[PDB]
UniProtKB/Swiss-Prot annotation, chain B:
<comment type="similarity">
    <text>Belongs to the glutamate-gated ion channel (TC 1.A.10.1) family. NR2A/GRIN2A subfamily.</text>
</comment>
<comment type="subunit">
    <text>Heterotetramer. Forms heterotetrameric channels composed of two GluN1/zeta subunits (GRIN1), and two identical GluN2/epsilon subunits (GRIN2A, GRIN2B, GRIN2C or GRIN2D) or GluN3 subunits (GRIN3A or GRIN3B) (in vitro). Can also form heterotetrameric channels that contain at least two GluN1 subunits and at least two different GluN2 subunits (or a combination of one GluN2 and one GluN3 subunits) (in vitro). In vivo, the subunit composition may depend on the expression levels of the different subunits. Found in a complex with GRIN1, GRIN3A and PPP2CB. Found in a complex with GRIN1 and GRIN3B.</text>
</comment>
<comment type="function">
    <text>Component of N-methyl-D-aspartate (NMDA) receptors (NMDARs) that function as heterotetrameric, ligand-gated cation channels with high calcium permeability and voltage-dependent block by Mg(2+). NMDARs participate in synaptic plasticity for learning and memory formation by contributing to the slow phase of excitatory postsynaptic current, long-term synaptic potentiation, and learning.</text>
</comment>
<protein>
    <recommendedName>
        <fullName>Glutamate receptor ionotropic, NMDA 2A</fullName>
    </recommendedName>
</protein>
Amino acid sequence: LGLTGYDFFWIVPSLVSGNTELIPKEFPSGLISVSYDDWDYSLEARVRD
Amino acid sequence: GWDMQNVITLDTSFEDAKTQVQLKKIHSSVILLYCSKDEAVLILSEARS
């Protein structure tokens, strides 16, 4: 429909952006999302907290 | 002071190829349709869809 491009910023919650290792080919780049940190906040830190 | 939005030419198959994308960029206005009745039926059915 022409609603994706340099002018549209699609912002979606963690519900659709879960399992970051799997990315469908129909997700436009620049798809802003928010999610719980899995890179910096390590499992050992999780257990300690 | 006419406002001619675009010129659409559905040269290839109507419901198969990229033609639908063009038909999807038409907004609320008057559609000057020029085609034979047999294919105009298909065009109007697709527009209703």
